[PDB]
Write a protein that binds this DNA or RNA. Structure first.
Ligand SMILES: [Au+]
Ligand SMILES: [Au+]
Ligand SMILES: [Au+]
Lengths: 70, 120, 128, 63
DNA sequence: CCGCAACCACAGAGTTTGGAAATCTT
DNA sequence: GAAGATTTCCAAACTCTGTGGTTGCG
């Protein structure tokens, strides 16, 4: 369709859209903000499980020895 | 998601909504499963027919088998399937030779898809 | 398993198959975006690659055909106004051979499901 | 509004913007991938711990 | 008559893409 | 002091999903 930039519906629509775009980008910001946080959150979880795996392993080994060496 | 038997005893595929809107992205991603062995990379494509519609317009109906499963990225159905009528889709696994699995009265494609009962 | 216990019985009794066992109107289903012209060009062009995409207008059953593993071949000249095709297949665990012709101008033809006995016996044995 | 300087000054900036955006865009995608990676490593170490658990559990029972 | 199951239009919010216009950095 | 990079303001073109207006058929 062909419309006039002076009309009303054009402005009403053109404004409301602008509002939705303000909300739309203002939302995307938080997703990126969260994605980055999740990176730290995960990096921490991984190091924490690395120590859990590393530890739980040494325990299983040392535990076996006493079982086979006795 | 939930898988069901195809008309071919060697493949299982996702269950599709009984009814669904044209060009509207599926509720769940469509998957084709291979019980026998299928080397990865093996292409798969779906097509759907109907006594009233013989070849419906599909979107992204081509996928690659990986670890015995065909995962489709937004398979969309475009042509309608006719009132009260459903499509029958044809999964085609491209190996030597090609294997074919049909899945009769699989999904119904209308232009409105399921709607709340019009309140009049 | 690539196939069921016994293809025979099924193909012969199974409504779905029988109905297709006997020649029926089939049409090309390639690109429908481009006017008739491009299509035939495409189909024929695809015939060059040994890839065609057809479906039994009657039932509505859609099928993608591949021509290389009676025999798996494609003829030109038997009748110069159309094309004769044969495609190997395993429709629902029943090794079959799809045969039929299409008028290269109409992009319409008629084919039949021809349950390959050699393949069916072969698959049955190789399968366990 | 039509000055010779505008024809340039304006389109001049645009070039810097397009670039800025394209840069920041890649920075995000890369961050996403980074999440996927860490997610993978997380899911492995996770399953790996549940493993060594039952593996040491069953070993505690044999005692 | 009414309600169902289809079609068609088409609001109206959400997204995406990209050129302005202010601001900030270096 | 200001060119280039970063951020904010807008516009226009699409994509998504829902609500109505209408129909043949029970
Ligand atoms: Au549609
Ligand atoms: Au040809
Ligand atoms: Au024939």
């Amino acid at each position: 369709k062909t419309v006039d930039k002076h009309s009303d519906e054009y402005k009403i629509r053109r404004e409301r859209n602008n509002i939705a775009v303000r909300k739309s980008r203002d939302k995307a910001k938080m997703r990126n903000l969260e994605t980055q946080h999740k990176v730290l959150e995960l990096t921490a979880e991984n190091e924490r499980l690395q120590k859990k795996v590393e530890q739980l392993s040494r325990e299983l080994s040392t535990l076996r020895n006493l079982f086979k060496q006795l | 998601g939930e898988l069901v038997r195809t008309d071919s005893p060697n493949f299982l595929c996702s269950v599709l909504p009984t009814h669904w809107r044209c060009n509207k992205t599926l509720p769940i991603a469509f998957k084709v499963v291979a019980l026998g062995d299928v080397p990865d990379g093996t292409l798969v494509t779906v097509m759907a027919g109907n006594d009233e519609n013989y070849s419906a317009e599909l979107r992204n109906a081509t996928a690659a088998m990986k670890n015995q499963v065909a995962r489709f990225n937004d398979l969309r159905f475009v042509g309608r399937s006719g009132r009260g009528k459903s499509f029958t889709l044809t999964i085609t696994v491209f190996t030597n030779p090609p294997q074919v699995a049909t899945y009769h009265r699989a999904i119904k494609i209308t232009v409105d898809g399921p709607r709340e009962p019009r309140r009049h | 398993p690539r196939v069921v216990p016994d293809q025979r019985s099924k193909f012969e009794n199974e409504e779905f198959f029988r109905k297709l066992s006997r020649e029926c109107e089939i049409k090309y289903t390639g690109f429908r975006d481009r006017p008739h012209e491009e299509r035939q060009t495409r189909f024929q062009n695809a015939c060059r690659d040994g890839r065609s995409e057809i479906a039994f207008v009657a039932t509505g059953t859609n099928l993608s055909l591949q021509f290389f593993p009676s025999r798996e071949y494609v003829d030109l000249e038997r009748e110069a106004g159309k094309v004769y095709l044969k495609a190997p297949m395993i429709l629902n665990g029943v090794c079959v051979i799809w045969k039929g012709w299409i008028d290269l101008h109409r992009l319409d033809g008629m084919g039949c499901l021809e349950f390959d006995e050699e393949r069916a016996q072969q698959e049955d044995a190789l399968a366990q």
